[PDB]
């Protein structure tokens, strides 16, 4: 359960279904497994909430980790089907909190920034961030020159 909590381990959902369908069998303790999983009611919607969580978590971490991606390879790497991703991503766009992008003619889809409207921070990042670290390299490589010139 803590293993599910930081990138969730890019896995097959049914292995976790093994690991958490053992819990209705597990011990005399069965009522948390009843409330979450062993219910033919809201707990079955909690099963489907775990489905929601796994596809939603693929969205949560992979929407950081997207540059360019095909459609159906995504659809089968979401621990689910291909055409079922129609509904299974229409819910993730009525999620409406991730700005996204898909193409159905060529399959190349993509979750990214709104298409480079401001080109500045490339220049700013390189010049200011790295090259001001490089003008600090003078300030602290003369310090490390003094470090090595202790014994020199």
């Amino acid at each position: 359960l803590l293993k599910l909590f930081t990138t969730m381990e890019l896995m097959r959902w049914s292995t976790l279904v093994e690991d958490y369908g053992m819990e209705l069998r597990k011990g005399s303790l069965e009522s948390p497994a009843t409330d979450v999983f062993g219910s033919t009611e809201e707990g079955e919607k909690r099963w489907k909430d775990l489905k929601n969580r796994v596809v939603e978590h693929n969205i949560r971490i992979m929407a950081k980790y997207y540059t360019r991606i095909t459609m159906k390879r995504m659809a089968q790497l979401l621990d689910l089907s291909v055409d079922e991703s129609e509904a299974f991503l229409s819910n993730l766009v009525v999620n409406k909190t991730i700005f996204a992008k898909v193409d159905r003619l060529a399959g190349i889809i993509n979750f990214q920034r709104p298409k480079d409207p401001n080109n500045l921070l490339n220049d700013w990042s390189q010049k200011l961030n790295s090259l001001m670290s490089l003008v600090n390299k003078t300030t602290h490589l003369i310090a490390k020159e003094e470090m090595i010139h202790n014994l020199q």
Binding site: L120, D123, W124, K127, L131, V135, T139
Partner: protein
């Protein structure tokens, strides 16, 4: 040495650390529109008649040097890629 440590300290930038380049130009094109229309609205009302009246109110419109020096800064700081890089 205090001249050195006045235009090296008491004026900002210890010269490794200046070469704001762009967001100042967003604000500066705000400048170079807002200052511009006021540079436009006034000299329409210059002495377009033949009057020999001699009593000015003085405001000295012109707004040249802001444009000039700020955009020399903008061009030679847009140079920074081709200057510091290669």
């Amino acid at each position: 040495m205090l001249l050195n440590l006045h235009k090296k300290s008491w004026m900002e930038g210890l010269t490794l650390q200046d070469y704001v380049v762009k967001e100042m130009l967003e604000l500066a094109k705000n400048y170079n529109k807002a200052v511009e229309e006021e540079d436009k609205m006034t000299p329409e009302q210059l002495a377009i008649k033949n009057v020999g009246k001699q009593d000015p109110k003085r405001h000295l419109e012109e707004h040249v040097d802001v444009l000039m020096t700020s955009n020399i800064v903008q061009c030679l700081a847009a140079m920074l890629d081709t200057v510091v890089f290669k």
